[PDB]
Amino acid sequence: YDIQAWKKQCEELLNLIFQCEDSEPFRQPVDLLEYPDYRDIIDTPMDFATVRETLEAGNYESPMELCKDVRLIFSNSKAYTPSKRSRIYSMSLRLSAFFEEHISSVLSDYKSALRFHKR
């Protein structure tokens, strides 16, 4: 029922994600020089370094907020892909499955801890 435990859990999951080869396209904000139409398609860029920095700054209140930003990485990838059979899009889908597998217990434990706190 530790209301704070999500934060280190998220730090460790981001470490795992940074070790995954599938995260390479998503570790830093997209360079518009490589992809000059990116901001014509994507309104809100997001990347894992931005998520880690937001966490480390103390600017997430809950793991739900972190989860919304990580999901935005994957939805941007789906929105920007020219094909479902894209190398970088397929990397996003495997990394998304890995992230969802690991974040589920973090979210569950947090919401349970908050319910206990308000009991």
Ligand SMILES: COc1ccc(NC(=O)N2CCN(C(=O)c3ccco3)CC2)c(F)c1
């Ligand atoms: C040298 O540091 C960097 C900085 C940024 C990046 N990443 C990118 O430019 N990507 C291309 C666009 N993209 C897609 O979702 C997508 C779907 C289909 C095609 O692209 C997101 C990531 C990189 F690879 C190295």
